[PDB]
Amino acid sequence: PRVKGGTVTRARRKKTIKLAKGYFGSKHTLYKVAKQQVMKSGQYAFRDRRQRKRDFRKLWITRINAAARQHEMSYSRLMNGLKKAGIDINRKMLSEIAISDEKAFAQLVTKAKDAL
Amino acid sequence: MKLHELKPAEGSRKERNRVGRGVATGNGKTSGRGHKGQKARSGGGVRPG
Amino acid sequence: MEAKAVARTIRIAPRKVRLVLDLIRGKNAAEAIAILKLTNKASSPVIEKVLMSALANAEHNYDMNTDELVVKEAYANEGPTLKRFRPRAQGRASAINKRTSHITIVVSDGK
Amino acid sequence: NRSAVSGGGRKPWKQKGTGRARQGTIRAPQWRGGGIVFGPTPRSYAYKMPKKMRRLALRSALSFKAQENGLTVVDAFNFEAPKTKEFKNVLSTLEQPKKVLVVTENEDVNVELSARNIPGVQVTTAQGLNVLDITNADSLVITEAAAKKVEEVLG
Amino acid sequence: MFAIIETGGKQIKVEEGQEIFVEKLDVNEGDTFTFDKVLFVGGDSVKVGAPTVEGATVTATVNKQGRGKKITVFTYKRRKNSKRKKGHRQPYTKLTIDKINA
Amino acid sequence: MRQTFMANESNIERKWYVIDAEGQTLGRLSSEVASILRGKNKVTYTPHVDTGDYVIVINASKIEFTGNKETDKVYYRHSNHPGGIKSITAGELRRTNPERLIENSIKGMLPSTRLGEKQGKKLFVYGGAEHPHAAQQPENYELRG
Amino acid sequence: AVPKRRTSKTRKNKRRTHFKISVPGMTECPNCGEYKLSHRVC
RNA sequence: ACCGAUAGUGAACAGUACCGUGAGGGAAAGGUGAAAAGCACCCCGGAAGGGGAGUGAAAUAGAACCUGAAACCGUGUGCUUACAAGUAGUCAGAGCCCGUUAAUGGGUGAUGGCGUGCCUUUUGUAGAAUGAACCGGCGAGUUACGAUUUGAUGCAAGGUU
RNA sequence: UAACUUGGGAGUCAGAACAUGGGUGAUAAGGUCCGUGUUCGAAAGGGAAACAGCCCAGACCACCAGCUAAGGUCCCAAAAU
RNA sequence: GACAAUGGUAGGAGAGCGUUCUAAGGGCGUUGAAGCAUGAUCGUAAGGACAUGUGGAGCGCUUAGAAGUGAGAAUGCCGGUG
Ligand SMILES: [Mg+2]
Ligand SMILES: [Mg+2]
Ligand SMILES: [Mg+2]
Ligand SMILES: [Mg+2]
Ligand SMILES: [Mg+2]
Ligand SMILES: [Mg+2]
Ligand SMILES: [Mg+2]
Ligand SMILES: [Mg+2]
Ligand SMILES: [Mg+2]
Ligand SMILES: [Mg+2]
Ligand SMILES: [Mg+2]
Ligand SMILES: [Mg+2]
Ligand SMILES: [Mg+2]
Ligand SMILES: [Mg+2]
Ligand SMILES: [Mg+2]
Ligand SMILES: [Mg+2]
Ligand SMILES: [Mg+2]
Ligand SMILES: [Mg+2]
Ligand SMILES: [Mg+2]
Ligand SMILES: [Mg+2]
Ligand SMILES: [Mg+2]
Ligand SMILES: [Mg+2]
Ligand SMILES: [Mg+2]
Ligand SMILES: [Mg+2]
Ligand SMILES: [Mg+2]
Ligand SMILES: [Mg+2]
Ligand SMILES: [Mg+2]
Ligand SMILES: [Mg+2]
Ligand SMILES: [Mg+2]
Ligand SMILES: [Mg+2]
Ligand SMILES: [Mg+2]
Ligand SMILES: [Mg+2]
Ligand SMILES: [Mg+2]
Ligand SMILES: [Mg+2]
Ligand SMILES: [Mg+2]
Ligand SMILES: [Mg+2]
Ligand SMILES: [Mg+2]
Ligand SMILES: [Mg+2]
Ligand SMILES: [Mg+2]
Ligand SMILES: [Mg+2]
Ligand SMILES: [Mg+2]
Ligand SMILES: [Mg+2]
Ligand SMILES: [Zn+2]
């Protein structure tokens, strides 16, 4: 029996084109360049799911450094003092406390200074 | 058994390998022949011995 | 509240037709007629006939007053292309496309 | 294939200098209207199995029928003239399912003619028994003489 | 008032009545869960754990056990005919904080 | 995407500072001012919005170099015409346009993005002791060092 | 001599930004109640 | 357990059209509707073509007639864009507009981080090495007879025609 | 924690840099030919501005958790003016 | 339940997805099949549903069988259109 090409080709290519939605010009229209961009999009997304954790740790550290300098202390000194005092609050929570409850962050800084 | 419930004996049948049908099979493109040389060609390869 | 007229397979290229349709789109009916009469382009008499046909449909089929009508829609779609050839030098032949347009005019009273 | 397609003897255009892909005949497989690469070619699909295996298959089908209470033995068939309605009445009285295989000792023409128009009913002889027929049937209606012959030959 | 709790290898800042999404907990929807790793309690009175605040618990109610949005993990190596596509749906437990116990 | 605060234009509060360049080293003052301009001194620092503060520098003519930078440090520019390279020494630039000297130092410490350009526009430099921005009520800022 | 790359739809339409005609300079004719080109006679 | 209009004969309507001095080469091209009931009549128009009105279950089934994909060409506009340097995405993210197979929703997107297409061939290619204008269809380990090996099954000093 | 034997199935026979023991060249070459090891090839990630072959280190998937390696902590640009 | 492993080209091994046809069984369809279009749906992947619109007469599912069985590249062939 003969198997014609049929509809599977169109269905698969349409899936790729739909994934390419919002891309510039031919990249949301033509299957070949859409497929190339979607492959790149996957590779980028994998890499960036990794890099985003570093990015947000970087942001938290920057904010903690600013708060510590407000309390006359460097980030490195503050973190060493917290470690010596046995406080395991991570950098996300530390930055969020420094933003929200300034008095609680001041208490944490005082404990860090005491441990040193 | 029944004609709507046929079953070959276990291990008696294996699907044939189809080369040249995409990368994911592991036999796409070069279809297991490697790259170039006499043995990559259609009809290629020296006589046995 | 709207009336339509279409001239299909007009032997003028859609780019050329759209040049004039862009002048008349959205204007009042009398202003569009004057623009078409005084526009020095090949498509102008053809578009004018389409617009007159639309206004006649508005008056005769839908009991519309022709003085209060606006060109709500005016567009040219691509029709089938006549494929031709031109002999060039060294025995070669170069393609010639004699394109066509479907011209649509829709007039409206605004209701 | 490319040899069998009509025409296509000459080279379409010179090997070099035209700027086109090189081609050798308008009937090549990548050409529209070209030859087919491989594809079907006439051949028989039949193959053989050892005779002992054939007999074991026949016995397996008959024993599957005897199990599952799908076998019934009639005393005799008394059809002197072919009468489809009377055979249908006989099947209804025997309380048989739709798919029945009727087995006679030899070629019984009146039984065959009576039964051959009812959908799902098939008639064979003792020597004609085969795995496809038996397995397809839900019930076997066999005469005593046919059953004795089947026992005699399949042992 | 707020608390810093440690669950699912991470830390969450919570207040009463807040919905939180955490790594899948061994519990059914509608049940009561208790977070016993309280690192810090803010608000009117500040308790600073070292590492945990002894006796501090946060009670919560399990609203939902679900799976996160589908992520298509796709990678490839150019010119090597090598690529891999996998699907992932990360399980999560959604809770609502009921009360913070200092 | 749990809980990290993000600053936006609705909750950003930018202050006005005044910094004296008298007897300060060009690069050290510049790095500190660049930090303030980018908002790195704020707990609410957010990289995709400008959370920094405005900075006025009020004694640019008294900025100081170490070593032999007055005659030996050379600023080069190119007009994009062949052989259109021009140069001026740091000392000559302090003598002629000290505001440009300090401004270019700080902007060279700022990033070269659209946001970085806007943040650099937040900088106002004046050669002499007076500045025209009393209406913004700038507050004296002491360099950390 | 020849285009190195095909022109995108975006680039083509950007180029055609100014490729258009203008409505002609026309004024009303008093007696006939119609329009004509300014400085032209019926 | 052959094809179904690029398939199957080259040819479903042709050894024709067309090409060549000649031998010779050699296409493209199927489908209204159940029934022609194939649009009386009115209106704009020289006509072509339309708008009504009618026929029809349906006319965006009106003959270039079943279905009507993509490239490509237009009309309208919800968000956005005229200080900006770019493989066009991705991760973060306000603002504005919507509201779903109800899902820790949809569209758009100021601004920040990261980021030199794909294939082939190469020691090594963003490569200024190859190939592709785009879209669609078609387009490459097959079958027969032998050999060998493994799995399965039957029988076994026998097995098999 | 392999090793060997017997059978089925291969691909490979253009290699490259770095370090080191040598020939050749000129104690020339990103040269060439051998020995030894690593990496690339077929390896992404961090560092060396960018930079297959150098340094750290081998990506099953998800996380807006933590500790480190090489390399770093004035600003660009995380961390010591 | 507690331990271990899971970068990868040539290449070896395994398990599967989907297409057309056939057999048997069981079903859907003018109260609207296939096809086409859209969607914020589901599965670890190939891919599978559902709803709406279009369409107007065929088509799924289960098990097994058989292949003209999967295209993005061949200065590929034909057609259409830039
Ligand atoms: Mg068929
Ligand atoms: Mg195909
Ligand atoms: Mg990490
Ligand atoms: Mg392989
Ligand atoms: Mg390939
Ligand atoms: Mg090759
Ligand atoms: Mg080779
Ligand atoms: Mg080889
Ligand atoms: Mg050959
Ligand atoms: Mg001539
Ligand atoms: Mg031939
Ligand atoms: Mg067709
Ligand atoms: Mg044909
Ligand atoms: Mg229709
Ligand atoms: Mg049609
Ligand atoms: Mg602007
Ligand atoms: Mg500027
Ligand atoms: Mg970049
Ligand atoms: Mg080379
Ligand atoms: Mg180039
Ligand atoms: Mg070549
Ligand atoms: Mg090319
Ligand atoms: Mg193509
Ligand atoms: Mg072979
Ligand atoms: Mg060398
Ligand atoms: Mg050397
Ligand atoms: Mg060596
Ligand atoms: Mg190689
Ligand atoms: Mg690497
Ligand atoms: Mg290795
Ligand atoms: Mg270097
Ligand atoms: Mg780098
Ligand atoms: Mg690499
Ligand atoms: Mg550390
Ligand atoms: Mg820093
Ligand atoms: Mg690994
Ligand atoms: Mg692997
Ligand atoms: Mg294999
Ligand atoms: Mg398989
Ligand atoms: Mg399958
Ligand atoms: Mg095929
Ligand atoms: Mg091609
Ligand atoms: Zn007049």
Curated annotation (Swiss-Prot), chain B:
Lineage: Bacteria, Bacillati, Bacillota, Bacilli, Bacillales
Cellular component GO terms, alphabetical: cytosolic large ribosomal subunit
One GO BP annotation of this record: translation
Location of this fragment in the whole protein: 1 to 49 of 146
Homology family: Belongs to the universal ribosomal protein uL15 family.
Sequence ranges of Basic and acidic residues compositional bias: 1-18
Assembly and binders: Part of the 50S ribosomal subunit.
Species whose genome carries this gene: Staphylococcus aureus (strain USA300)
Keyword Transcription found: no
Transmembrane helix among keywords: no
Protein name: Large ribosomal subunit protein uL15
Curated annotation (Swiss-Prot), chain E:
Composition-biased stretches (Basic residues): 80-91
GO MF annotations, alphabetized: rRNA binding; structural constituent of ribosome
Any matching Pfam family: Ribosomal_L21p
Alphabetized SUPFAM superfamilies for the sequence: L21p-like
Keyword annotations: Ribonucleoprotein, Ribosomal protein, RNA-binding, rRNA-binding
InterPro entries: bL21-like, bL21-like_sf, Ribosomal_bL21
GO cellular component: cytoplasm; ribonucleoprotein complex; ribosome
Region annotated Disordered, chain positions: 80-102
GO biological process, one term: translation
Role summary: This protein binds to 23S rRNA in the presence of protein L20.
Assembly: Part of the 50S ribosomal subunit. Contacts protein L20.
Family: Belongs to the bacterial ribosomal protein bL21 family.
Name under which the protein is recorded: Large ribosomal subunit protein bL21
The organism of origin for this protein: Staphylococcus aureus (strain USA300)
The encoding gene: rplU
UniProtKB/Swiss-Prot annotation, chain F:
Subunit structure: Part of the 50S ribosomal subunit.
Similarity comment text for this entry: Belongs to the universal ribosomal protein uL13 family.
InterPro entries: Ribosomal_uL13 (IPR005822), Ribosomal_uL13_bac-type (IPR005823), Ribosomal_uL13_CS (IPR023563), Ribosomal_uL13_sf (IPR036899)
Known role: This protein is one of the early assembly proteins of the 50S ribosomal subunit, although it is not seen to bind rRNA by itself. It is important during the early stages of 50S assembly.
GO biological process: negative regulation of translation; translation
The protein's name: Large ribosomal subunit protein uL13
Keyword field: Ribonucleoprotein, Ribosomal protein
HAMAP family given in the database record: Ribosomal_uL13
PANTHER family from the UniProt entry: LARGE RIBOSOMAL SUBUNIT PROTEIN UL13M, RIBOSOMAL PROTEIN L13
Pfam family, one: Ribosomal_L13
Domain of life, source organism: Bacteria
Entry keyword annotation includes Plastid: no
GO molecular function: mRNA binding; structural constituent of ribosome
Gene: rplM
Keyword Transmembrane helix: no
GO CC aspect terms: cytosolic large ribosomal subunit
Gene3D superfamilies reported for this sequence: Ribosomal protein L13
Biological source species: Staphylococcus aureus (strain USA300)
Swiss-Prot record, chain G:
GO molecular function, one term: structural constituent of ribosome
Gene Ontology CC entries for this record: large ribosomal subunit
Keywords recorded for this protein, A-Z: Ribonucleoprotein, Ribosomal protein
GO annotation, biological process: translation
Protein family per UniProt: Belongs to the bacterial ribosomal protein bL32 family.
Name of protein: Large ribosomal subunit protein bL32
Full-sequence range covered: 2 to 43 of 57
